[PDB]
Ligand binder design. Structure first.
Ligand SMILES: CCCC[C@@H](CN[C@@H](CCCC)C(=O)N[C@@H](CCC(N)=O)C(=O)N[C@@H](CCCNC(N)=[NH2+])C(N)=O)NC(=O)[C@@H](NC(=O)[C@@H](NC(C)=O)[C@@H](C)O)[C@@H](C)CC
Length: 203
């Protein structure tokens, strides 16, 4: 299908014979599911995101049906806030990111979807993250007024400064909206700005 980003891109998946809800997440390298039992052996791993790391169980070669499309690959199981389908499985089902509903660039998900943005008169690299509600940019001395906010990622919450009505040009496409500034490991463009540029998931 084609999926717009005004709402979280939640879909039903089937895994181990059970149905679950999960977020299609272009900003995730891997697929991470809440605690459950899976057939087969697993091994311990750590994965990270905002706020640091969690311990997970890695299962390899697990069949997963994602909105009716078949994948077989690695599933990490542990205390993730949200079930997420990451690039390891999105690539198996042929998912791409498309600007302006496919009139604009197509971004495949073989590697992290990093693009150039312009914000506050600076050029920066940022990850297009369909699993992010909001846009989070690394500490940057923006002039002007802000309000405090906390935002939560795989390893916890971080404190950020919320700035409103900030222009952000994304690969040449002009957007304007709320930007959160704080200590993220990667600059993140979230749905609040992806929607303004007509970005869709397609598979
Ligand atoms: C779990 C919560 C939902 C998914 C998550 C995906 N964000 C990416 C951002 C990239 C890192 C800052 C992420 O955590 N990615 C991980 C997912 C875990 C995974 N293993 O795939 C990742 O790829 N981690 C890499 C590390 C990044 C560097 N890797 C690399 N360069 N190859 C990894 N392998 O450990 N979204 C978020 O973290 C966002 N959270 C949200 O959108 C919502 N919050 C919550 C708690 O649901 C909203 C209510 O605030 C943050 C950014 C605030 C807007």
């Amino acid at each position: 299908p084609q999926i717009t980003l005004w709402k979280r891109p939640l879909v039903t998946i089937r895994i181990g014979g059970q149905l679950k809800e999960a977020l299609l997440d272009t900003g995730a390298d891997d697929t991470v599911i809440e605690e459950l039992n899976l057939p087969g052996c697993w091994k311990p791993k750590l994965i990270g995101g905002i706020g640091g790391f969690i311990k997970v169980r890695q299962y390899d070669q697990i069949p997963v049906e994602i909105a009716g499309h078949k994948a077989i690959g690695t599933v990490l199981v542990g205390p993730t806030p949200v079930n997420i389908i990451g690039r390891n499985l999105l690539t198996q089902i042929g998912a791409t990111l498309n600007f302006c509903g496919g009139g604009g660039p197509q971004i495949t998900l073989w590697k992290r979807p990093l693009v150039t943005i312009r914000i506050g008169g600076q050029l920066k690299e940022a990850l297009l993250d369909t699993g992010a509600d909001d846009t989070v940019i690394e500490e940057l001395n923006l002039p002007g007024c802000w309000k405090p906010k906390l935002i939560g990622g795989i390893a916890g919450f971080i404190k950020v400064r919320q700035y409103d009505q900030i222009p952000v040009e994304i690969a040449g496409h002009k957007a304007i909206g709320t930007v959160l500034v704080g200590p993220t490991p990667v600059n993140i463009i979230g749905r609040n700005l992806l929607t303004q540029i007509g970005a869709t998931l397609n598979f």
